[PDB]
Amino acid sequence: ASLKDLEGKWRLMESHGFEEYMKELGVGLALRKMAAMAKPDCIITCDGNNITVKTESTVKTTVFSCNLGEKFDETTADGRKTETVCTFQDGALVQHQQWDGKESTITRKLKDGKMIVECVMNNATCTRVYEKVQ
Ligand SMILES: CCCCCCCCCCCCCCCCCCCC(=O)NCCO
Numbered sequence: 001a002s003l004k005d006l007e008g009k010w011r012l013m014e015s016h017g018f019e020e021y022m023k024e025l026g027v028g029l030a031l032r033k034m035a036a037m038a039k040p041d042c043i044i045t046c047d048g049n050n051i052t053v054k055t056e057s058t059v060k061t062t063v064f065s066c067n068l069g070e071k072f073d074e075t076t077a078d079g080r081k082t083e084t085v086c087t088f089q090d091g092a093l094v095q096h097q098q099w100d101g102k103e104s105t106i107t108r109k110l111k112d113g114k115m116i117v118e119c120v121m122n123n124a125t126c127t128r129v130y131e132k133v134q
């Protein structure tokens, strides 16, 4: 699996543990239900080391653009202001966020033609499965 393998337009097909993950993040109920219901597309572009992740929905669209391994300031879809580093490790794009002495990691990996997005914060894990839009 490679970084360029992640590039493209992706649609959410399956989600597990998302609500609990968002609660661990501190997302309130109203916002949680909105997030869970509006099921996005995630557009990723990989121009060399320069990685852009755009998450699009009818309710909110967020984008970050980073260089691999360089720390950057991210404003997340729920409004957290984090310091983030993306790395590439064992076939996965690893996005590590830190804010308020807390941390979360989001891993994106191509498995069997699908993008698997694993989100961890503390004891709360979320798995989200995306498929490539034709
Ligand atoms: C999928 C993005 C959430 C939908 C966009 C926000 C919609 C409503 C606005 C605010 C509600 C906040 C929802 C959770 C935001 C960030 C949690 C991590 C999302 C993520 O990377 N999730 C892994 C999949 O990319």
Ligand SMILES: [Cl-]
Residues within 6 Å of the ligand: 063, 064, 073, 074, 075, 076
């Ligand atoms: Cl930002």
